[PDB]
RNA sequence: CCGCUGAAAGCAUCUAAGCGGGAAGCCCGCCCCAAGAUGAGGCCUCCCACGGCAGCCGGUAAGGACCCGGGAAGACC
RNA sequence: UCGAUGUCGGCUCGUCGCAUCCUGGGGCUGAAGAAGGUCCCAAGGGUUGGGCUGUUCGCCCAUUAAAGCGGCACGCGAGCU
């Protein structure tokens, strides 16, 4: 007997809100939806997961000294491009994307959870575009 | 100020205070007014 | 040997309604905010108001007195309203009245004119001295740092800005 | 923020109080609002200016069609002038007085794939004591082995010139509005009879 | 670095709650590029609902390309 | 690494470190003032032209806001000498 392969299944659209929650400890449950490891059926080569469409991510919570000590980096490619920027101000700037960049990192890398990172769409502000999708709104 | 990893009461005037995670030590003497560094 | 056990004499008529993490007060002169810890409890008693604190920890133990303090300042100002006399000395230097700002001459290359901002009103009894006067304390107390810093004292003369009240020490030259 | 769109026609000399002001002029207007850029509609404030008038037998359908909207003559070149709003349906150089200031855009002239000692000033080699064809060469790129590989935005042999350039706080010198002329003290990019903007200065 | 208010620690303390001042340096602003930004964005106008049997073949539309006369554009492009 | 990794200095071209030569912001000063001394923050930009010598370096002339020290195979010979 050989083990059991699920041909094309409908995905599932959650819905979460982040305010007053922990930042890592908040993507890594998305993550995992997005890998689909919530699944009995789950498959590693496939992208049958969750869609997770993250909403008030302005408002994720973070312990420490981190606004002022938490450093996301970028490099422009050219001498002295090493970009410093501080959890503060990407907040006071672009907001969704300290969300974004976190579960990123817990999706694994190659072009699979790169298309899974396709599948996570995290907006600033209770709100979100994805009315026609009617996500089912999820507790964690 | 003076800036050292030597910094000691200098008077009975001088006072030791931690301030900001750093360890200064101020007084009525300016002169020993001091940062640990 | 400790503050926030200190009850807080509230004179009349000057009221204290507690809200959590706050406390407003109103008075003849104004009304003020104080913003609080959660973590304590403010205890309304006839013409008298205290904080405890639920614990020994230090940092409840710290938070108390600071608490204490802050309410039973801002009762003063609502009622006393607080004030500092500010001392001018320097030959040339003046201090004059302009409507409500404040223009102080003290030998820079200019006039140094400061505007008095919201609740601080300031006053010139003399053109030597001057009163900042408020019912709030780390506004009065600060807006008068703020016009010292203009022209501090020096070391070696009684010329600049001095508190009332603040020591006249001086170095010598040669 | 007023702008203009223009052409630029040469640049000569004038006299001003016993003085000699170095002059280029540009046939700046008439330029017809064509479009009114908006928040709500494409979220942004501007003005698609046009200028030149066209032959229609060169203006295609959509071209032809746009300029319909806005009850528009053809014409020739369209460039907008960003978080700008004129009070009417056109502009011209009386948008600006003598003695204000400007800043100017022009496609600079284009001096094809030039060397090193054009483009970036480089000095070369020697021209003896032993060049040995070098003597218009750059020099070294990089170091060796660490960091064994060139750096990006290096300054090497290419095209240069031909490329949008942009000067600023230049001195309107008079306005002849008989015939759309602004005289400008100083040099503008680009050819005469080149296409340039001339927008507001935005120093102080 | 300089402070305001201020406990712990009845005084004191720029800090432990909180608020200020302050570098040619960090962020924005200025000039130039840039939606291959595959997260491939937006706006204006134009075209259309063609025949035969998310594909194919054939003829058009709006358009473009080749060809030519050339250009302070350019090695060819 | 010797079935080869060419070794000093210069020219050209940079770029980084900061134990900072300059410009900027501060404390102390036996800081009156001007000008200096000594630690602290800061690497954005700048840091000349010459005479001797193969020279790096150093000395010297004239200046300067100043004429900084160092890493990149004592940066850089399929780039020159
Ligand atoms: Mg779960
Ligand atoms: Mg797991
Ligand atoms: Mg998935
Ligand atoms: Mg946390
Ligand atoms: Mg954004
Ligand atoms: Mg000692
Ligand atoms: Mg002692
Ligand atoms: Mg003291
Ligand atoms: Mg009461
Ligand atoms: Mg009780
Ligand atoms: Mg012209
Ligand atoms: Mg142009
Ligand atoms: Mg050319
Ligand atoms: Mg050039
Ligand atoms: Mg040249
Ligand atoms: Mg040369
Ligand atoms: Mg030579
Ligand atoms: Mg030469
Ligand atoms: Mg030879
Ligand atoms: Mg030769
Ligand atoms: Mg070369
Ligand atoms: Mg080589
Ligand atoms: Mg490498
Ligand atoms: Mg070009
Ligand atoms: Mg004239
Ligand atoms: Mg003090
Ligand atoms: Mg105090
Ligand atoms: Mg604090
Ligand atoms: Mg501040
Ligand atoms: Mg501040
Ligand atoms: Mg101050
Ligand atoms: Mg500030
Ligand atoms: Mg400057
Ligand atoms: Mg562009
Ligand atoms: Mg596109
Ligand atoms: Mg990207
Ligand atoms: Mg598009
Ligand atoms: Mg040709
Ligand atoms: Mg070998
Ligand atoms: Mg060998
Ligand atoms: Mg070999
Ligand atoms: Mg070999
Ligand atoms: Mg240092
Ligand atoms: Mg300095
Ligand atoms: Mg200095
Ligand atoms: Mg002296
Ligand atoms: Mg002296
Ligand atoms: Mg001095
Ligand atoms: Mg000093
Ligand atoms: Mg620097
Ligand atoms: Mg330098
Ligand atoms: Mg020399
Ligand atoms: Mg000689
Ligand atoms: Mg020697
Ligand atoms: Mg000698
Ligand atoms: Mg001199
Ligand atoms: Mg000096
Ligand atoms: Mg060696
Ligand atoms: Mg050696
Ligand atoms: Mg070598
Ligand atoms: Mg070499
Ligand atoms: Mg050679
Ligand atoms: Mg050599
Ligand atoms: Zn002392």
Request: glycine fraction near 10%; include cysteine; charged fraction near 30%.
């Amino acid at each position: 007997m050989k083990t059991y392969v699920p041909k094309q299944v409908e995905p599932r659209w959650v819905l979460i809100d982040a305010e007053g929650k922990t930042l890592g400890r908040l993507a890594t449950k998305i993550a995992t939806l997005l890998r689909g490891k919530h699944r009995p059926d789950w498959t590693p080569n496939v992208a049958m997961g969750d869609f997770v469409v993250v909403v008030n991510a302005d408002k994720i919570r973070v312990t420490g000294k981190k606004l002022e000590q938490k450093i996301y980096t970028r490099y422009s490619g050219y001498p002295g491009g090493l970009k410093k920027i501080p959890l503060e101000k990407m907040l006071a700037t672009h907001p969704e994307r300290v969300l974004e960049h976190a579960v990123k990192g817990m999706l694994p890398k190659g072009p699979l959870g790169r298309r899974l990172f396709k599948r996570l769409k995290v907006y600033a502000g209770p709100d979100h575009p994805h009315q026609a999708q009617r996500p089912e709104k999820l507790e964690v | 100020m003076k800036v050292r990893a030597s910094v000691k009461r200098i008077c009975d005037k001088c006072k030791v205070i931690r301030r900001h995670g750093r360890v200064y030590v101020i007084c009525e003497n300016p002169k020993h007014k001091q940062r640990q560094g | 040997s400790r503050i926030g056990r200190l009850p807080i004499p509230v004179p009349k008529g000057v009221s204290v309604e507690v809200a959590p993490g706050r406390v407003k007060v109103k008075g003849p002169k104004g009304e003020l905010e104080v913003p609080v810890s959660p973590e304590m409890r403010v205890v309304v008693e006839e013409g008298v108001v205290r904080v405890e604190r639920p614990s020994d920890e230090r940092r409840h133990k710290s938070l108390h007195g600071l608490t204490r303090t802050l309410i039973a300042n801002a009762v003063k100002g609502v009622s006393e309203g607080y004030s500092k006399e500010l001392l001018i000395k320097g030959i040339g230097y003046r201090a004059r009245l302009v409507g409500r700002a404040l223009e102080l001459t003290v030998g820079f290359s200019h006039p140094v004119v400061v505007e008095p901002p919201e609740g601080i009103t300031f006053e010139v009894p003399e053109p030597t001295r001057v009163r900042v006067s408020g019912i709030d304390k780390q506004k009065v107390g600060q807006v008068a740092a703020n016009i010292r810093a203009i022209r501090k004292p020096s070391a070696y003369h009684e010329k600049g800005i001095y508190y009332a009240g603040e020591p006249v020490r001086l170095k010598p030259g040669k | 923020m007023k702008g203009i769109l223009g052409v630029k026609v040469g640049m000569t000399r004038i006299f001003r109080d016993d003085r000699a002001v170095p002059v280029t002029v540009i046939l700046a207007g008439p330029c017809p609002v064509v479009q009114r850029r908006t928040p709500e509609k494409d979220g942004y404030t501007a003005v698609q200016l046009g200028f030149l008038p066209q032959n229609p037998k060169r203006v295609n359908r959509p071209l032809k069609g746009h300029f319909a909207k806005a009850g528009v003559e053809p014409v020739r070149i369209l460039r907008e002038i960003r978080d700008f709003n004129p009070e009417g349906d056109t502009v011209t150089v009386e948008i600006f007085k003598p003695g204000e200031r400007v800043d100017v855009t022009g496609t600079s002239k284009g001096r094809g794939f030039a060397g090193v000692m054009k483009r970036w000033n480089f000095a070369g080699g020697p021209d003896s004591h032993g060049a040995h064809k070098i003597h218009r060469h750059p020099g070294s790129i990089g170091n060796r082995k660490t960091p064994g590989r060139v750096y990006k935005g290096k300054k090497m042999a290419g095209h240069y010139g031909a490329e949008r350039v942009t000067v600023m706080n230049l001195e309107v010198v008079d306005v002849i509005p008989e015939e759309n002329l602004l005289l400008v003290k100083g040099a503008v990019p680009g050819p005469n009879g080149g296409l340039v903007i001339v927008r507001e200065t935005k120093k102080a």
